[PDB]
Every structure is written in C-alpha cells, then in structure tokens.
DNA sequence: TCGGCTCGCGCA
DNA sequence: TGCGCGAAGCCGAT
C-alpha cells in the first residue's frame, strides 16, 4: 500500500475492512526498535497516505512469569529507551497489561483506530492473539515481517528439510530484499508507567530467582547492556575487532569471538538486515564473512521457517521420521546416567564440561554457541526418555537464556535432540542415529580445561 | 539413480 | 590443529 523504497511483499493482509478515519496503530511485539523496522516504516507510510498520525502499542502479557528477572529487566530497560526515541519523532507509545486478544481489541475501539499493523512471529501464542483480535475488530489488519531479511512466507512455501535446500532459495532473493532502510519520518499531526511495571514484575519474580548457597544471585547483569543504542555498539565492535577471526574461532568457547548479538536480535532491539548490510560492506576475511552470513541469514531464518510450517515445533512429532523411528527403538536402552530437571538445572552431573556449560548459562544468560549443542545432546543421553529430554532442554533454555523463547531455540533444540535439519549418523545405544558429541571430541577442538576453570 | 549433506577418529 | 575418511538416510536435480 503506497511507497517507493517499500516492497509490498513484506506486508500481507490479515483482515479486510473499511479503513477508519483514525490513527494507524502499530501493535509492536517482536521488533522492539525504532530504526530499521519495516513494520513501523509501513505503518508510517500508511498513516501518511491517510493524513493521520501513527501510534505504537505494546501489550505486556503474563508470559514474563514463566521466565526470570534477567529477561524482564533486559526487555523493560530497552522499552524505556524506546519510549524516548519514539517521543523524539513525535510518535506516542502506549503500554497495556493483560491478554492481547482483549486489550488490543479494546484499544482499537477506544482510540478509534483506522488501521492496525503488527510485526511477524511464527510462535503459536502470537497466532492465537491474532485470531482473537481479528474477531474483535472491524478495521483492516496487516502483518509485516520486520525480523527476516526475506519475508518468511516468501522465502519458501513449505517446511525446508535442510539448510542446503533452503540456501539457494534464500540467496536468490537477496538482491531484491537486501536493501537500505529509509528514515522514519516523524509524525506531522500532534496526537501505564513502565517504571511501575518494572517494579511490580520484579517483586513477583523475586522468589523464583536463581541463587547460590550464600543466597547471592547467580545472574551477572553487566555482560550485556540492553537497548537499541547499546546493540549498535555491539555490532560495531564485532565488525571492527571480531569479524576477521570469526570463521576460525566461532567454535572455540574459550575465545570471546562471537558477535554477541542474540539478546538484541531476539527482542528486536537491532535488525538482522542492518547487521547483514554492514557485514556485506565490511572488508574482512572472506571465509569469515561467508560463515557469519550463513548463521544470521540461513540458520536464523530457517528457524522461522521451521516454526511457521510446523506448529508442533517444540514436540517429538516434529522430528523427521528416521529420527523418530531410531529414538523409539532405543526407549528401553539402559541409560548410563539419569538426571532430573533439578539436577541438570543446578549443574550437578558427573560431566564437568556439561556443568561448566550450565554455569555459563546460569551466570551470564548466554551459553556459547558450540557448547549449546553439547549441552542439549547430553540431556538426551542422560534422561528417561526423548520427550523428557526435549522438555528439560526447552525449560532450561527458555528460563535462563537471554535470547530464549525464540524460533532459533526450538529449531536448535530440535536439531540437537531430534535431528531436524540434520542427517543420520552412526548407530549408538540410547541416542540411536542422532549425531553424537563427546567430551573427547571437544578436548581436541578447544582447551576444555580453560572453559571449565572459568565457570567453576 | 546418484551427490552431498553446520560429528568422531587416525594421522601429519 | 588441519585433513580425509567413515557411517548413515534422504532430498532433489534428472
Ligand atoms: C540447543 C540450542 C539452543 C539454542 N538456543 C537458542 C535460543 O534460545 N535463541 C537463539 O536465538 N538461538 C539459540 N541457539 C542458536 C545459537 O546458539 C545462538 O543463536 C548463538 O549462540 C547466539 O549467540 P551469538 O549471537 O554471539 O552467535 P553468532 O555466532 O554471532 O551468530 C549470529 C546470529 O546468527 C544466528 N545463529 C547463529 N547460530 C544459529 C543457529 N544454530 N540457529 C539459528 N540461528 C543461529 C543467530 O541469530 C545469531 O545471533 C541455540 C542453538 C542450540 C544448538
């Protein structure tokens, strides 16, 4: 609908209707940023064509009770900064509390909205809210993919079996969809306290905090500063200092050579399209650029593909047939060790490498990418059943990862435990034909002892 | 009816 | 450390 630097394939209609005479409302959810946001840019362009202002609404749900203070504070502090940035562009933001299915519909009527726009998430709960809102409004409802470089429904029309089949489809569409962002034009027409929501939510989550023996908190909040401004700083330091060595050291957890962008990417405080634009233009090791681009383009956006075309993305049923048949055959194998959720959570296994990985997770909220594979695969090896392993890995991932509760997490766990986007490997007890990883294999790839000593 | 897929292992 | 191979099931280009 209108636009010159505005590709209409990024937007799709969720509900037809008569465009009201009120303001355009951007229901912001996944992409919590003011710059490099196609959903906010499309909302502004529609408002300009109708000579109305654009407003932003955010609904704080009860979902923060299922996680911890680490994610709540990170999100909320980012939203406080975002509120000021939108105010500088004369864009007011409204923060609601409750069920989006009820609050968003009530806000549309009470504010006499003319058009509703939201960003795109393939998670189940977002589809439920969208269906509830459609049944409660009479104005047009649009959805914009602001998170993927290529719109999820455009990159592929089906579940992609492997990255090597998805890779040519995605890269063929890069020349069309990889582009610069236009500037967010401020509003022309003029038209709950976040500090109170922060204190009320923290007081609720306090009894569930992760503590050590001295009742001292485990989480170290100084590793990652939240917000759109801090995300840009992280990206800049990655390109200048770490991108060159990324290809060689990406799988060495003793070196801080990752981009460290996932907390910002998950909450949408930075755009992956922006990161890709800057990495494309940087002059660095070609093998490092290719390796990093493959991670933030192929693997990130195939995770959205997985969740979008497999609504059981967090269940055993989503695994490929060969993996289900293999794991079913080994359900009666004696496990060398069986640990409960509580024993995994406290890092009380026999494996010091596994315990150190859990300690990095508990203390920093961001486990290194390589040890996340080892961490999840040992949960499968030392659990009663594949379903219990899946349940334990998802629980700990979403509870403690700053970047958790994310398509990348469900696809990554499904890769580790059920071979989604992987292939069959040598037959073993318990784990069957699922790709195996061993302590001795890690010892030959990086200094395992240094990683263990850093995290007790 | 093939070719090639994001481990462990033996060997420089 | 870096390389080549093994062990596995299957998509997709034909
Ligand atoms: C068991 C398991 C659980 C994971 N949990 C999550 C999760 O909850 N949330 C999450 O965003 N990712 C998760 N990952 C993927 C990956 O581990 C992290 O995205 C990565 O470590 C994030 O840190 P980084 O940004 O410094 O990594 P970088 O090496 O700098 O990669 C940059 C970005 O590329 C994407 N990316 C990288 N690796 C993957 C991958 N394997 N799959 C999909 N996208 C990827 C990410 O968006 C990432 O932020 C998980 C992977 C596994 C195997």
Describe this structure as you would to a colleague:
With 456 residues, this protein is of the alpha/beta class. The protein has three domains: 146 residues, no CATH class; 169 residues, no CATH class; 141 residues, no CATH class. 50% of the residues lie in helices and 7% in strands. It has a six-stranded mixed sheet, with helices on both faces. Helix 3 packs parallel to helix 4 and helix 14 packs across helix 19. The chain is globular and about 65 Å long. The termini are far apart. Bound molecules: flavin-adenine dinucleotide. Flavin-adenine dinucleotide binds next to helix 9, helix 11, helix 15 and helix 17. It binds a DNA duplex (12 and 14 nucleotides) through helix 6, helix 11 and helix 18. The PDB classes it as dna binding protein. Keywords: Flavoprotein, photolyase, light driven electron transfer, DNA repair, time-resolved serial crystallography., DNA binding protein. It forms a trimeric assembly.
